[PDB]
Assembly symmetry: D2
Homo-oligomer: 202 residues x 4
C-alpha cells in the first residue's frame, strides 16, 4: 500500500521554556505541552497506524472520526489540533501585536466594540461548564463566539477560527486554581493578535 | 427577501414505489414549508436577514440556537433531499469517477448500498443517513433529528431521510422496505454533480 | 422467564378521535412488540435473566448500553402510554387532589394543558412528553427518543408519545391536532392512581 | 409562607486540614472544598431562594433541575451533592476499614474478584474523558460501574451509589498534574470501605 510511513509531530512553542506571564507560567506550559499535548499526539498516532487513516492529514482524520462517530479517535485527534491552534493564539506580552484595522471593524460590527467583545468572550468562557474551549469564529464576514465542551472544535465546521481559549482546568489550575476569571483576564495580555489577523485573511 | 421554495419537479407525479405523491404532499407542503416559515420568522428582524441559508445554519450551530438550527437546517436538508431523487426513469447512472471512489471505500457498489442501508436502519429515532466525500475518501454518516454534514468541512453526496414522516404513510414501520425501494429513485447524476462542483 | 405484553383492552376499538385502531395496530403490534422481542433477545444468556424490566433499564442506563437501553425503555414507555389513555366516554375526571397540585404547579388546569401541549409540540424529533411528581411538586419533562423518567427518582404520572409513528397515520404533520384531540382520551383515572402509592 | 426558612450547608471533612496523603494533599482539599464545594453551595442556595424550590431537599432540587432542563441549577445543585458524597467515600489510610464479607460477595459476583473490580473501576475512570465522576452503583443487588460527565450523577437515578471518585482535573492537578492514573492508583489507599458498606445496607 505504501512504504512512506508518516506520523504527526509537534514542535516546541517558541515560548515554551520562558512562559507566558502573567497569564500562563512556564511550569504550566511544561505539563500542558509535554504532558497533555504529547499524550494526545501519541494516542492519535497509535490509533491511526495500520489503518486506512495512516498518513492522512490531521483534519481528514478529525472529520473521519466525527462522521463515523469514533469517540477515542475524535477526542485525541481534535485535542491534538486544538492545542496546536491554541499555541499560535498566544505570544509573550511584548510580541502580541495589535488588532488590525480590518479585524477591529468586524469586531465592532459584530459586538459593538473591542472592549465589549472581550467581556462577552470572557463571560462565555467563564460560563462554559466543565472542560472545553471558547472560540472566536468568522462566518463569511460575520463574527461569533462559540463554546465547545471537551475536544469539540470548530475545526470540523465550515467556519474560520480566529482565536480560542482553553478552559480545561489543566490550562490554568497550577497558576490560578479555581479562579478561572483571573486566568481569562490575564490571558488577554498574551493573545497573539498577529495570528488572529492572519487567520482572518483566509 | 425571505427564503423561498419551489415545488420539486415530480411533486404531483410522486416517486413510486418509494414515496407516493400523497406522502410528498405532506412532506413538502407540510414539513418542508413549515420549516421554511419558522426559519423566515426566526430571521426576520435580526442581523441574519439577507444572509444565505448556510450562513444562517452555521450561525445557529456556533451560537447554540436550537430553534433556529432545527428549522433552518431542516430547511436545507429537504432541499438537498429532493435534489437526491428522481422518478425511476430519470435517475441516470453512477459515473466512472464515482464508482471508483465507491469501490475504494466499500469494495463494491453492492457493498456500499448494503452498508448504507444498514446504517439507515440502525439510525434510531429521527434523523438522516449520508454519504459524504472527505477529500477523496467516502464515508457513511448517521445524524440525528436536524443534524447535517452541511455544517462540516465535507461534501455531502447523498442523503436519505429516516424521520418516520418520510415513509410512514406508504410503509408504516417497514423502514428497510422503504430504503431498498428508495434506491430506485436515487438521482445519480445529482450525486455525480456533487462530486464535481 | 421472558417479558410479555398483553393486548390493550381497547386495541380493536381505537381512541377516536385521537388515535385510530389502525394506528394502534401498527403502534402496538408493530413497534411495541418489536421492542419486546429485542429486549428479550438481549437479556437471553446474560446475567439479566430474572431481573425486572426496571432493573434492566437501570443496568442499561448506568453501563451505557444503547441497544439494551433503547429497546427496554421503549418497551416500558409504551406500556405506560397505554394505561394513560382510555376511550373518551371512559376517561374519568381530574380529582381534587391532582387539581390542587396542577394549579399549585401550573396556575390552572387550562394553563397546564396549554403548557404540557406547547411542550409536546416543541419536543423536536422523536420523544415523549411527561407529567412527573417530585415528592409533591409536579413538572413537565421533555425526553428524546427512548429517554424516560422511569430511570429517575420521580414518579411518572402521564405521558404522550410524540414519535411520528404515534400519530402520523391519523394526523400526518398535524401534531397539534393530535395533541388537541389526545386530551379527550387521557385516562385521568390512571394519572390520579399514579399520584398515590 | 412558613416561619422556618432553611438553607443547604456544608461541614468540614474531618481530614480537611490533615489531608489524605499520598492521594490528596491538604492544599488540594482547601481549594477543592473551600473553593469548589462552597462555590457550588452558595450558587445553589442563591438560585433556589425566593423560588418555589426554597426549603426543598437537595435531591428534590436536583430532580426539578433535571426534569425541567435547568442547566445552571442542575450543575450547581448536583455538584453540591457529588462532593458531599465524595468526602464520605474517603478516609486517611489508617482509618479506611476493610471490605466486609457481604460487600466482597457482591463484588466477586458482578466483577469476578476485588482485584478485577479495582482495575475495571480504575480503567473506567482513566477513560472518563474530560471532567466527571466514576461510580460504583447497586441496582437492586447487582453492582455496576458508571462513568458520568461534568455534574451528572446517579443521585438522579433509581440506584444506590456506593462509591465515587472525582476525575475533574481540579481534584488532582495540584498533586498529580496530568498523571490521572497515579492519582487513581493512590486514591484506592484512602477509600473509606466502611462508608461503602453502609451505603449497601441502608
Ligand atoms: Fe488543554
Ligand atoms: Fe423530512
Ligand atoms: Fe411509540
Ligand atoms: Fe470536584
Amino acid at each position: 500500500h505504501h512504504h512512506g510511513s508518516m506520523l504527526f509531530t509537534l514542535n516546541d512553542p517558541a515560548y515554551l521554556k520562558t512562559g507566558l506571564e502573567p497569564a500562563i507560567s512556564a511550569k504550566t506550559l511544561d505539563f500542558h505541552f509535554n504532558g497533555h499535548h504529547k499524550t494526545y499526539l501519541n494516542k492519535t498516532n497509535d490509533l491511526v497506524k495500520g489503518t486506512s487513516l495512516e498518513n492522512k492529514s490531521l483534519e481528514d482524520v478529525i472529520l473521519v472520526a466525527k462522521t463515523t462517530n469514533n469517540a477515542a479517535l475524535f477526542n485525541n485527534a481534535t485535542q491534538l489540533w486544538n492545542h496546536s491552534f491554541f499555541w499560535d493564539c498566544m505570544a509573550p506580552t511584548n510580541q502580541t501585536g495589535q488588532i488590525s484595522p480590518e479585524l477591529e471593524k468586524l469586531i465592532k460590527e459584530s459586538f459593538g466594540s473591542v472592549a465589549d467583545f472581550k467581556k462577552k468572550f470572557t463571560d462565555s468562557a467563564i460560563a462554559n461548564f466543565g472542560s472545553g474551549w471558547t472560540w472566536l469564529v468568522n462566518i463569511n464576514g460575520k463574527l461569533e463566539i462559540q463554546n465547545t465542551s471537551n475536544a469539540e472544535s470548530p475545526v470540523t465546521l465550515r467556519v474560520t477560527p480566529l482565536l480560542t481559549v482553553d478552559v480545561w482546568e489543566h490550562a490554568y489550575y497550577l497558576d490560578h486554581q479555581n479562579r478561572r476569571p483571573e486566568y481569562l483576564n490575564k490571558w488577554w495580555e498574551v493573545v497573539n493578535w498577529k495570528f488572529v489577523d492572519q487567520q482572518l485573511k483566509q
